[PDB]
Amino acid sequence: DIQMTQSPSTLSASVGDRVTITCRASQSISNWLAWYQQKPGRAPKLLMYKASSLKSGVPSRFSGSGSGTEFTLTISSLQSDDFATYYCQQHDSSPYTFGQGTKLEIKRTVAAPSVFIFPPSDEQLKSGTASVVCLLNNFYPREAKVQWKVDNALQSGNSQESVTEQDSKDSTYSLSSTLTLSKADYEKHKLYACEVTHQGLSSPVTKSFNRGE
Amino acid sequence: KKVVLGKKGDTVELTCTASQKKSIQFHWKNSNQIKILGNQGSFLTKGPSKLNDRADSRRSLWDQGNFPLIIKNLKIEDSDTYICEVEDQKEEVQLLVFGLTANSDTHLLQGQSLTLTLESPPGSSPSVQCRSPRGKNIQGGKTLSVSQLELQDSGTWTCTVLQNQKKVEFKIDIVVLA
Amino acid sequence: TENFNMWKNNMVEQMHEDIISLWDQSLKPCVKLTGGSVITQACPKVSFEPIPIHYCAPAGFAILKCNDKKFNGTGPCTNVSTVQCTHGIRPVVSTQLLLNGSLAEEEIVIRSENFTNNAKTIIVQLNESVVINCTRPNNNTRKSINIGPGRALYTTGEIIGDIRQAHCNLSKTQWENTLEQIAIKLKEQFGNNKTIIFNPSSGGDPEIVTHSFNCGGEFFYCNSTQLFTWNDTRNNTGRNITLPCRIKQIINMWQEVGKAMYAPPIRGQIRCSSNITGLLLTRDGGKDTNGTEIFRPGGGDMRDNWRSELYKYKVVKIE
Amino acid sequence: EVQLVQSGAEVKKPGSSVKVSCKASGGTFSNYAINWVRQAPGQGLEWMGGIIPIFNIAHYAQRFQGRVSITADESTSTAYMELSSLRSEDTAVFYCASPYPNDYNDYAPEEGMSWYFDLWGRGTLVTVSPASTKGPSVFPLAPSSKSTSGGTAALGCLVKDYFPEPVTVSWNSGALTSGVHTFPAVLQSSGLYSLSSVVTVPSSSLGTQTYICNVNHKPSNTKVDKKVEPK
Ligand SMILES: *C1O[C@H](CO)[C@@H](O)[C@H](O)[C@H]1NC(C)=O
Ligand SMILES: *[C@@H]1O[C@H](CO)[C@@H](O)[C@H](O)[C@H]1NC(C)=O
Ligand SMILES: *[C@@H]1O[C@H](CO)[C@@H](O)[C@H](O)[C@H]1NC(C)=O
Ligand SMILES: *[C@@H]1O[C@H](CO)[C@@H](O)[C@H](O)[C@H]1NC(C)=O
Ligand SMILES: *[C@@H]1O[C@H](CO)[C@@H](O)[C@H](O)[C@H]1NC(C)=O
Ligand SMILES: *[C@@H]1O[C@H](CO)[C@@H](O)[C@H](O)[C@H]1NC(C)=O
Ligand SMILES: *[C@@H]1O[C@H](CO)[C@@H](O)[C@H](O)[C@H]1NC(C)=O
Ligand SMILES: *[C@@H]1O[C@H](CO)[C@@H](O)[C@H](O)[C@H]1NC(C)=O
Ligand SMILES: *[C@@H]1O[C@H](CO)[C@@H](O)[C@H](O)[C@H]1NC(C)=O
Ligand SMILES: *[C@@H]1O[C@H](CO)[C@@H](O)[C@H](O)[C@H]1NC(C)=O
Ligand SMILES: *[C@@H]1O[C@H](CO)[C@@H](O)[C@H](O)[C@H]1NC(C)=O
Ligand SMILES: *[C@@H]1O[C@H](CO)[C@@H](O)[C@H](O)[C@H]1NC(C)=O
Ligand SMILES: *[C@@H]1O[C@H](CO)[C@@H](O)[C@H](O)[C@H]1NC(C)=O
Ligand SMILES: *[C@@H]1O[C@H](CO)[C@@H](O)[C@H](O)[C@H]1NC(C)=O
Ligand SMILES: *[C@@H]1O[C@H](CO)[C@@H](O)[C@H](O)[C@H]1NC(C)=O
Ligand SMILES: *[C@@H]1O[C@H](CO)[C@@H](O)[C@H](O)[C@H]1NC(C)=O
């Protein structure tokens, strides 16, 4: 069976800059490849088939090259309508395998992530469980691993991630993490935190709260 | 000579096996020794046979060395002695085709008689042996009729025709009402 | 003494497994169906052409050709000769008719494994090759261009005919005189008092019922009914026999048991002119059929196609 | 035109079965080779199975051998793909792709046979959750007195426990275009959802003006006019 691999995974690309994507196979598959674009929450659409042949109604800035094992997707100029994900399919033999995926994003100055915390109300705790929100507003790059430190004891379970894509405002990100423990595991503890790791702001500055006023 | 019983208007499957699990050239001839089915290499052939198109074979099993002969919708004239000349070591098999019916609507009144007329091939003498939902066995030969037909006889009857330690169970419907 | 046996030969099995190996490297199907499981793959069209072959014994062995007029095909020969390789042969995969092969110098020669066995095919080798012209016309696309003052030069491409439909041609006169010659050799084999009749194929897979073959990377199927209908007493004088054919995508593999599907025809024209070197026949007797024998087209096993051209050869050890 | 039409959004509790549809708007049906493709949330494309144009043969990937059955309905010109024995991991989107329908009577391409996907279904999301239709439980979120961000703080409206999707969290049909971050929904440990629609405004919005996060949910017609209240 054929294994596909793209490069790079993440792509901090600027505007207008000429960029090239790769895809390597597990065996010689001739010139039978295809490149797909897919915008967020939308069906993928074919641009390049036959490894390099363009299709009717496809822009000219897109250029497919290569054969055998190594392949490349090149783009001359770059507009604001080409920031999607790209997949390599291999229409050689079944089973048809696809690519890993490469997110083409925008680049800007390394924005300082914003640490902020939301106080959970009692209509939220006196109903089922407890809520804790360490919201990060406007930062960069996307790669910013968050850690959770409640009661000093390192957290290793009940923490979920949830980010948003890049907006057409200032190309920034926003995330939010939460805990899934009730008022029983709440009264038993009093100290909290959420130290996020990132090169933009090294020092683990954190915002938290204590039981009551 | 093996034997197989087949029901008029039904599919049957004559079998034929060579030693090793390999696909080799076979054939099927009747009493007059006429081609019915063969195989040129890995293709299927046919013959001038009466069942020119009613024959077939599961080509998937040819690779395992089993060369069937599947006859479907068979009448009665066809019941003969079939030969499977495979690689010199030919094999024979006898085909018998029986069938039963009534010469009166199965929706009978209480007491009336019901005459089951059987269709036998010109060769062997069948051995009829009916059985109600109750189980009252009646033995015959060419025909088999039931005298008193009670009300608790309603349901389905199993008239099994035996011949040569092999049998083919039938299924007739009987409705008695008044 | 040196006994020959063309039917229990081993070059025939060797060549068979080699010729199959050629195909499975120079002719890939868009999807093959064998052993239940199914594989589909891209299938770039290619111009496959029957390319001559010499059978060559390995280091230490020799092949033996028997050069006797009217050879049994089996049984001790007298005027034998040694070789190293066989004269070039064309590996024609075809049914009902053997093509582009060697012929008899003298008269027609019918050979069989068992004449009385009606389940055994009858290899009929001709002494005079009949020519067949098969071709898919370029009838289909209707292009044209408007020429005039102020006229730009575009081309209007629209297809109007069946891009899969072809036909072959045969000399009516040649073929008739050919059949009447085979019937002569048959009467001098089963009896002069016997009557001869040719009749179409009984039934079965498409490849057998209809004279199939490969030409230009495409698979033909030719309704050879006009060919084998002749009752001795039945385009009468000097015309041109023409039979219907069709390119198919879905063919049943001859290599093993199964089906395969290939890409649609290619643009342009597809033409092959070949020699009818011989025909694969088959007989059918049913406990004495009054006093008349019928003969149908056979074929389907490619060992037969090989055997027709390896009947004089025998490989042996030179100890 | 010549598009492909897919069926709506499916909600299934584990252990059931669902059969998705896919009609071919134009062309000729026998020319289509409809293959089904799966895409799990936050994951890449994955092939599943398809039919063979002039065979009726349907082949599937080894992963989905005895679980999927792809059928073709000639009468209505629709293709179906049923999925048996539903678990939680099969939550995904199922597109029906297909190489352009070239007329059977047409000279062969250079690819021989086109196994690339030209046409794509709009998308059919299939979520496997145990829970049934629940109303979006809205909760308040007030600003903090000890703010050290940059003068500007942040309020919000933490919508928790709802099902199914979607659920638009607009503010007065457009209260502000800056700082509004309507995060995506996530499945809790159970079978519900939880997003966090927040926004950043000047610290001078105590009582001069405050926005309301009007939360809707047409599938259960639940509405909420929760007014944001500071502290
Ligand atoms: C040959 O002659 C017979 C009549 O004697 C006729 O029925 C048959 O159709 C003719 N040709 C064949 C063998 O089909
Ligand atoms: C040709 O050889 C065969 C095989 O032995 C044998 O039947 C006979 O010698 C010849 N043919 C005839 C006329 O029977
Ligand atoms: C070989 O066989 C033929 C049989 O017809 C015989 O006539 C001929 O003399 C032989 N060859 C020679 C030249 O010895
Ligand atoms: C075809 O047959 C003719 C004799 O009619 C022969 O001269 C020619 O070489 C043959 N063509 C080939 C090479 O098969
Ligand atoms: C073909 O064989 C016959 C004898 O069967 C012979 O008379 C003839 O000369 C050969 N070829 C031709 C047509 O010259
Ligand atoms: C030739 O074929 C007949 C078919 O009836 C068979 O009976 C006979 O045994 C065969 N002869 C030989 C060579 O054994
Ligand atoms: C058939 O084709 C050949 C080769 O193209 C040509 O020489 C001949 O005139 C054509 N006519 C016949 C005899 O079929
Ligand atoms: C195409 O031309 C051939 C002769 O070259 C003819 O036999 C056939 O009928 C034609 N097909 C049509 C009508 O397009
Ligand atoms: C075959 O023969 C017919 C005779 O009318 C002729 O019209 C046709 O063009 C021939 N086919 C070819 C070109 O081989
Ligand atoms: C065969 O067909 C051609 C037309 O393609 C015709 O001109 C020729 O006379 C025919 N050949 C003969 C005489 O058999
Ligand atoms: C035909 O020849 C055979 C030779 O065995 C003979 O017995 C028979 O009487 C002949 N039939 C006719 C038509 O007289
Ligand atoms: C061959 O000839 C007979 C003559 O009676 C005919 O009935 C039969 O259909 C033909 N067989 C084939 C191959 O269809
Ligand atoms: C070719 O074969 C089919 C068999 O069904 C027959 O119906 C048709 O008439 C034949 N065509 C010819 C060559 O006349
Ligand atoms: C076949 O012969 C008949 C009888 O004259 C004739 O009508 C027809 O033109 C010939 N077919 C062709 C054109 O080959
Ligand atoms: C038969 O041989 C000739 C000459 O080599 C070749 O041109 C033709 O294509 C061959 N026919 C077949 C069966 O492909
Ligand atoms: C075939 O059988 C019939 C039986 O009535 C017989 O009269 C006839 O002469 C036979 N055919 C011939 C001419 O051999």
PDB file of C-alpha atoms in Angstrom, chain C residues 56-257:
ATOM      1  CA  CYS C  56      15.701 -21.518 -27.153  1.00  0.00           C
ATOM      2  CA  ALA C  57      16.823 -24.500 -25.071  1.00  0.00           C
ATOM      3  CA  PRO C  58      19.241 -23.739 -22.201  1.00  0.00           C
ATOM      4  CA  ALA C  59      22.956 -24.517 -21.943  1.00  0.00           C
ATOM      5  CA  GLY C  60      23.323 -28.237 -22.550  1.00  0.00           C
ATOM      6  CA  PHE C  61      20.079 -28.944 -24.386  1.00  0.00           C
ATOM      7  CA  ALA C  62      19.016 -29.076 -28.021  1.00  0.00           C
ATOM      8  CA  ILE C  63      15.754 -28.849 -29.920  1.00  0.00           C
ATOM      9  CA  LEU C  64      14.877 -31.338 -32.646  1.00  0.00           C
ATOM     10  CA  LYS C  65      12.941 -30.448 -35.785  1.00  0.00           C
ATOM     11  CA  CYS C  66      11.212 -33.168 -37.787  1.00  0.00           C
ATOM     12  CA  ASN C  67      11.138 -32.424 -41.513  1.00  0.00           C
ATOM     13  CA  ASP C  68       8.825 -35.092 -42.919  1.00  0.00           C
ATOM     14  CA  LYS C  69       6.143 -34.469 -45.543  1.00  0.00           C
ATOM     15  CA  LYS C  70       2.650 -35.030 -44.113  1.00  0.00           C
ATOM     16  CA  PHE C  71       3.739 -35.511 -40.495  1.00  0.00           C
ATOM     17  CA  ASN C  72       1.435 -37.388 -38.109  1.00  0.00           C
ATOM     18  CA  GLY C  73       2.227 -34.814 -35.449  1.00  0.00           C
ATOM     19  CA  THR C  74       3.077 -37.715 -33.185  1.00  0.00           C
ATOM     20  CA  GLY C  75       5.083 -40.916 -33.573  1.00  0.00           C
ATOM     21  CA  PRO C  76       8.718 -41.640 -34.594  1.00  0.00           C
ATOM     22  CA  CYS C  77      10.151 -39.401 -37.324  1.00  0.00           C
ATOM     23  CA  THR C  78      12.956 -40.341 -39.739  1.00  0.00           C
ATOM     24  CA  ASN C  79      14.368 -37.123 -41.237  1.00  0.00           C
ATOM     25  CA  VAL C  80      15.015 -35.275 -37.973  1.00  0.00           C
ATOM     26  CA  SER C  81      17.515 -32.446 -37.442  1.00  0.00           C
ATOM     27  CA  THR C  82      19.052 -30.634 -34.478  1.00  0.00           C
ATOM     28  CA  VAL C  83      18.816 -26.917 -33.791  1.00  0.00           C
ATOM     29  CA  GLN C  84      19.409 -24.481 -30.969  1.00  0.00           C
ATOM     30  CA  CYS C  85      16.425 -22.161 -31.401  1.00  0.00           C
ATOM     31  CA  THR C  86      13.105 -22.345 -33.248  1.00  0.00           C
ATOM     32  CA  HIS C  87      12.300 -20.275 -36.335  1.00  0.00           C
ATOM     33  CA  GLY C  88      10.629 -17.015 -35.300  1.00  0.00           C
ATOM     34  CA  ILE C  89       7.015 -17.435 -34.236  1.00  0.00           C
ATOM     35  CA  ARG C  90       4.288 -14.820 -33.845  1.00  0.00           C
ATOM     36  CA  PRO C  91       2.414 -15.226 -30.514  1.00  0.00           C
ATOM     37  CA  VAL C  92      -1.097 -14.618 -31.843  1.00  0.00           C
ATOM     38  CA  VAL C  93      -3.691 -14.814 -29.067  1.00  0.00           C
ATOM     39  CA  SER C  94      -6.889 -15.486 -31.004  1.00  0.00           C
ATOM     40  CA  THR C  95      -9.843 -17.857 -31.213  1.00  0.00           C
ATOM     41  CA  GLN C  96     -11.582 -19.692 -34.067  1.00  0.00           C
ATOM     42  CA  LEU C  97      -8.740 -18.705 -36.389  1.00  0.00           C
ATOM     43  CA  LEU C  98      -4.978 -18.993 -35.995  1.00  0.00           C
ATOM     44  CA  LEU C  99      -3.121 -16.061 -37.515  1.00  0.00           C
ATOM     45  CA  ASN C 100       0.326 -15.172 -38.874  1.00  0.00           C
ATOM     46  CA  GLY C 101       1.742 -18.697 -38.590  1.00  0.00           C
ATOM     47  CA  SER C 102       3.625 -21.237 -40.720  1.00  0.00           C
ATOM     48  CA  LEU C 103       1.784 -23.295 -43.349  1.00  0.00           C
ATOM     49  CA  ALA C 104       2.081 -26.619 -45.148  1.00  0.00           C
ATOM     50  CA  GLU C 105       4.145 -26.780 -48.322  1.00  0.00           C
ATOM     51  CA  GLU C 106       1.932 -29.448 -49.879  1.00  0.00           C
ATOM     52  CA  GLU C 107      -1.765 -29.847 -49.091  1.00  0.00           C
ATOM     53  CA  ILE C 108      -4.004 -29.149 -46.090  1.00  0.00           C
ATOM     54  CA  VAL C 109      -3.196 -31.050 -42.897  1.00  0.00           C
ATOM     55  CA  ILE C 110      -5.752 -31.869 -40.216  1.00  0.00           C
ATOM     56  CA  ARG C 111      -4.200 -33.037 -36.963  1.00  0.00           C
ATOM     57  CA  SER C 112      -5.855 -34.144 -33.745  1.00  0.00           C
ATOM     58  CA  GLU C 113      -5.207 -35.816 -30.403  1.00  0.00           C
ATOM     59  CA  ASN C 114      -8.157 -38.146 -30.933  1.00  0.00           C
ATOM     60  CA  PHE C 115     -10.280 -37.975 -34.079  1.00  0.00           C
ATOM     61  CA  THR C 116     -13.000 -40.244 -32.694  1.00  0.00           C
ATOM     62  CA  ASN C 117     -13.182 -38.212 -29.501  1.00  0.00           C
ATOM     63  CA  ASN C 118     -15.620 -35.428 -30.356  1.00  0.00           C
ATOM     64  CA  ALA C 119     -14.532 -33.484 -27.273  1.00  0.00           C
ATOM     65  CA  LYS C 120     -11.067 -32.984 -28.783  1.00  0.00           C
ATOM     66  CA  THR C 121     -10.309 -30.041 -31.072  1.00  0.00           C
ATOM     67  CA  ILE C 122      -9.138 -30.438 -34.670  1.00  0.00           C
ATOM     68  CA  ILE C 123      -6.103 -28.345 -35.643  1.00  0.00           C
ATOM     69  CA  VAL C 124      -6.518 -27.554 -39.337  1.00  0.00           C
ATOM     70  CA  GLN C 125      -3.333 -26.169 -40.883  1.00  0.00           C
ATOM     71  CA  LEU C 126      -3.761 -24.494 -44.277  1.00  0.00           C
ATOM     72  CA  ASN C 127      -1.387 -24.730 -47.233  1.00  0.00           C
ATOM     73  CA  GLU C 128      -2.444 -21.359 -48.644  1.00  0.00           C
ATOM     74  CA  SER C 129      -2.987 -18.387 -46.328  1.00  0.00           C
ATOM     75  CA  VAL C 130      -6.251 -16.464 -46.714  1.00  0.00           C
ATOM     76  CA  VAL C 131      -5.993 -12.719 -46.122  1.00  0.00           C
ATOM     77  CA  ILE C 132      -8.228 -10.909 -43.616  1.00  0.00           C
ATOM     78  CA  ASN C 133      -8.546  -7.114 -43.324  1.00  0.00           C
ATOM     79  CA  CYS C 134      -9.876  -5.816 -39.998  1.00  0.00           C
ATOM     80  CA  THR C 135     -10.199  -2.111 -39.213  1.00  0.00           C
ATOM     81  CA  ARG C 136     -12.041   0.461 -37.118  1.00  0.00           C
ATOM     82  CA  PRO C 137     -12.952   3.345 -39.455  1.00  0.00           C
ATOM     83  CA  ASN C 138     -12.150   6.991 -38.752  1.00  0.00           C
ATOM     84  CA  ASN C 139     -15.818   7.741 -39.452  1.00  0.00           C
ATOM     85  CA  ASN C 140     -16.720   9.034 -36.050  1.00  0.00           C
ATOM     86  CA  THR C 141     -15.585  12.608 -35.291  1.00  0.00           C
ATOM     87  CA  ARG C 142     -17.078  15.231 -37.606  1.00  0.00           C
ATOM     88  CA  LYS C 143     -14.670  18.160 -37.515  1.00  0.00           C
ATOM     89  CA  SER C 144     -14.737  21.098 -39.923  1.00  0.00           C
ATOM     90  CA  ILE C 145     -13.605  24.701 -40.238  1.00  0.00           C
ATOM     91  CA  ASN C 146     -15.306  27.762 -41.671  1.00  0.00           C
ATOM     92  CA  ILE C 147     -13.194  29.522 -44.280  1.00  0.00           C
ATOM     93  CA  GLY C 148     -14.125  32.975 -45.458  1.00  0.00           C
ATOM     94  CA  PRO C 149     -13.398  36.700 -45.410  1.00  0.00           C
ATOM     95  CA  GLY C 150     -13.101  38.031 -41.857  1.00  0.00           C
ATOM     96  CA  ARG C 151     -13.427  34.456 -40.628  1.00  0.00           C
ATOM     97  CA  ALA C 152     -11.493  33.246 -37.588  1.00  0.00           C
ATOM     98  CA  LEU C 153     -10.237  29.665 -37.582  1.00  0.00           C
ATOM     99  CA  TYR C 154     -11.851  27.455 -34.952  1.00  0.00           C
ATOM    100  CA  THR C 155     -12.710  23.775 -35.316  1.00  0.00           C
ATOM    101  CA  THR C 156     -16.029  22.104 -34.450  1.00  0.00           C
ATOM    102  CA  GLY C 157     -15.540  18.680 -32.851  1.00  0.00           C
ATOM    103  CA  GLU C 158     -18.574  16.465 -32.259  1.00  0.00           C
ATOM    104  CA  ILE C 159     -18.819  12.654 -32.432  1.00  0.00           C
ATOM    105  CA  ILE C 160     -21.668  11.044 -34.393  1.00  0.00           C
ATOM    106  CA  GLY C 161     -20.881   7.321 -34.754  1.00  0.00           C
ATOM    107  CA  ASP C 162     -20.140   4.255 -32.604  1.00  0.00           C
ATOM    108  CA  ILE C 163     -16.427   4.572 -31.820  1.00  0.00           C
ATOM    109  CA  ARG C 164     -16.354   0.844 -31.036  1.00  0.00           C
ATOM    110  CA  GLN C 165     -17.746  -0.593 -34.265  1.00  0.00           C
ATOM    111  CA  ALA C 166     -15.448  -2.167 -36.831  1.00  0.00           C
ATOM    112  CA  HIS C 167     -15.464  -4.817 -39.564  1.00  0.00           C
ATOM    113  CA  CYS C 168     -13.183  -7.245 -41.441  1.00  0.00           C
ATOM    114  CA  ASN C 169     -12.916  -8.262 -45.081  1.00  0.00           C
ATOM    115  CA  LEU C 170     -12.221 -11.647 -46.665  1.00  0.00           C
ATOM    116  CA  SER C 171     -12.002 -12.869 -50.236  1.00  0.00           C
ATOM    117  CA  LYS C 172     -15.278 -14.729 -50.744  1.00  0.00           C
ATOM    118  CA  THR C 173     -13.713 -16.847 -53.467  1.00  0.00           C
ATOM    119  CA  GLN C 174     -10.575 -17.772 -51.501  1.00  0.00           C
ATOM    120  CA  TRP C 175     -12.466 -18.786 -48.369  1.00  0.00           C
ATOM    121  CA  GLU C 176     -14.968 -20.919 -50.267  1.00  0.00           C
ATOM    122  CA  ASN C 177     -12.244 -22.832 -52.097  1.00  0.00           C
ATOM    123  CA  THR C 178     -10.584 -23.182 -48.685  1.00  0.00           C
ATOM    124  CA  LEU C 179     -13.533 -24.796 -46.913  1.00  0.00           C
ATOM    125  CA  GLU C 180     -14.155 -27.153 -49.825  1.00  0.00           C
ATOM    126  CA  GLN C 181     -10.550 -28.255 -49.351  1.00  0.00           C
ATOM    127  CA  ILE C 182     -10.845 -28.965 -45.629  1.00  0.00           C
ATOM    128  CA  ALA C 183     -14.003 -30.980 -46.277  1.00  0.00           C
ATOM    129  CA  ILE C 184     -11.968 -33.070 -48.719  1.00  0.00           C
ATOM    130  CA  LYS C 185      -9.372 -33.924 -46.068  1.00  0.00           C
ATOM    131  CA  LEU C 186     -12.125 -34.632 -43.540  1.00  0.00           C
ATOM    132  CA  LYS C 187     -13.912 -37.002 -45.914  1.00  0.00           C
ATOM    133  CA  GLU C 188     -10.531 -38.700 -46.274  1.00  0.00           C
ATOM    134  CA  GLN C 189     -10.438 -39.229 -42.510  1.00  0.00           C
ATOM    135  CA  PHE C 190     -13.977 -40.120 -41.366  1.00  0.00           C
ATOM    136  CA  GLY C 191     -15.222 -41.638 -44.636  1.00  0.00           C
ATOM    137  CA  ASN C 192     -16.129 -40.729 -48.220  1.00  0.00           C
ATOM    138  CA  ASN C 193     -19.709 -41.853 -47.632  1.00  0.00           C
ATOM    139  CA  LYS C 194     -19.952 -39.286 -44.836  1.00  0.00           C
ATOM    140  CA  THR C 195     -21.365 -35.817 -45.517  1.00  0.00           C
ATOM    141  CA  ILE C 196     -19.642 -32.628 -44.347  1.00  0.00           C
ATOM    142  CA  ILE C 197     -21.255 -29.546 -42.818  1.00  0.00           C
ATOM    143  CA  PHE C 198     -19.929 -26.444 -41.118  1.00  0.00           C
ATOM    144  CA  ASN C 199     -22.006 -24.699 -38.465  1.00  0.00           C
ATOM    145  CA  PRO C 200     -21.322 -21.716 -36.130  1.00  0.00           C
ATOM    146  CA  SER C 201     -20.138 -22.005 -32.504  1.00  0.00           C
ATOM    147  CA  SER C 202     -22.539 -23.611 -30.020  1.00  0.00           C
ATOM    148  CA  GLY C 203     -22.310 -21.040 -27.233  1.00  0.00           C
ATOM    149  CA  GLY C 204     -20.256 -19.863 -24.275  1.00  0.00           C
ATOM    150  CA  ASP C 205     -18.085 -16.892 -23.326  1.00  0.00           C
ATOM    151  CA  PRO C 206     -18.021 -14.107 -25.954  1.00  0.00           C
ATOM    152  CA  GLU C 207     -14.376 -14.839 -26.818  1.00  0.00           C
ATOM    153  CA  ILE C 208     -15.321 -18.289 -28.116  1.00  0.00           C
ATOM    154  CA  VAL C 209     -18.666 -17.702 -29.850  1.00  0.00           C
ATOM    155  CA  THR C 210     -17.030 -14.972 -31.916  1.00  0.00           C
ATOM    156  CA  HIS C 211     -13.556 -14.893 -33.486  1.00  0.00           C
ATOM    157  CA  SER C 212     -11.763 -12.608 -31.046  1.00  0.00           C
ATOM    158  CA  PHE C 213      -8.213 -11.230 -31.168  1.00  0.00           C
ATOM    159  CA  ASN C 214      -6.003  -8.266 -30.336  1.00  0.00           C
ATOM    160  CA  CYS C 215      -4.997  -5.502 -32.730  1.00  0.00           C
ATOM    161  CA  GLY C 216      -3.416  -2.124 -31.960  1.00  0.00           C
ATOM    162  CA  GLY C 217      -3.920  -2.548 -28.227  1.00  0.00           C
ATOM    163  CA  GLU C 218      -7.650  -3.092 -28.784  1.00  0.00           C
ATOM    164  CA  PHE C 219      -9.774  -6.228 -28.358  1.00  0.00           C
ATOM    165  CA  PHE C 220     -11.930  -7.319 -31.306  1.00  0.00           C
ATOM    166  CA  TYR C 221     -14.928  -9.653 -31.475  1.00  0.00           C
ATOM    167  CA  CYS C 222     -16.013 -10.689 -34.958  1.00  0.00           C
ATOM    168  CA  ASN C 223     -19.359 -12.326 -35.732  1.00  0.00           C
ATOM    169  CA  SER C 224     -17.944 -15.140 -37.865  1.00  0.00           C
ATOM    170  CA  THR C 225     -21.291 -16.592 -38.870  1.00  0.00           C
ATOM    171  CA  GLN C 226     -20.828 -16.039 -42.605  1.00  0.00           C
ATOM    172  CA  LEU C 227     -17.510 -17.847 -42.303  1.00  0.00           C
ATOM    173  CA  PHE C 228     -18.703 -21.233 -41.070  1.00  0.00           C
ATOM    174  CA  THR C 229     -21.993 -21.709 -42.883  1.00  0.00           C
ATOM    175  CA  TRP C 230     -21.481 -24.091 -45.778  1.00  0.00           C
ATOM    176  CA  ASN C 231     -23.485 -27.159 -46.748  1.00  0.00           C
ATOM    177  CA  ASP C 232     -21.553 -28.123 -49.892  1.00  0.00           C
ATOM    178  CA  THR C 233     -24.619 -27.374 -52.040  1.00  0.00           C
ATOM    179  CA  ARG C 234     -25.314 -23.883 -50.654  1.00  0.00           C
ATOM    180  CA  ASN C 235     -22.330 -12.930 -53.042  1.00  0.00           C
ATOM    181  CA  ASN C 236     -22.231 -16.161 -55.004  1.00  0.00           C
ATOM    182  CA  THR C 237     -19.438 -15.772 -57.588  1.00  0.00           C
ATOM    183  CA  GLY C 238     -16.554 -13.370 -56.934  1.00  0.00           C
ATOM    184  CA  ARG C 239     -17.280 -10.825 -54.211  1.00  0.00           C
ATOM    185  CA  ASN C 240     -16.096  -9.820 -50.748  1.00  0.00           C
ATOM    186  CA  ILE C 241     -17.210 -11.460 -47.470  1.00  0.00           C
ATOM    187  CA  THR C 242     -17.510  -8.847 -44.708  1.00  0.00           C
ATOM    188  CA  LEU C 243     -18.210  -9.590 -41.042  1.00  0.00           C
ATOM    189  CA  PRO C 244     -19.285  -7.312 -38.130  1.00  0.00           C
ATOM    190  CA  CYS C 245     -16.956  -6.665 -35.207  1.00  0.00           C
ATOM    191  CA  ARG C 246     -16.822  -4.626 -32.026  1.00  0.00           C
ATOM    192  CA  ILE C 247     -14.102  -3.422 -29.697  1.00  0.00           C
ATOM    193  CA  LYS C 248     -14.894  -4.339 -26.100  1.00  0.00           C
ATOM    194  CA  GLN C 249     -13.617  -2.962 -22.815  1.00  0.00           C
ATOM    195  CA  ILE C 250     -14.776  -5.870 -20.639  1.00  0.00           C
ATOM    196  CA  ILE C 251     -12.975  -9.047 -21.667  1.00  0.00           C
ATOM    197  CA  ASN C 252     -12.560 -12.400 -19.911  1.00  0.00           C
ATOM    198  CA  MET C 253      -8.902 -13.089 -19.252  1.00  0.00           C
ATOM    199  CA  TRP C 254      -7.382 -16.047 -21.113  1.00  0.00           C
ATOM    200  CA  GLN C 255      -4.358 -16.104 -18.809  1.00  0.00           C
ATOM    201  CA  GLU C 256      -6.394 -17.196 -15.771  1.00  0.00           C
ATOM    202  CA  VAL C 257     -10.097 -17.458 -15.006  1.00  0.00           C
TER     203      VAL C 257
END
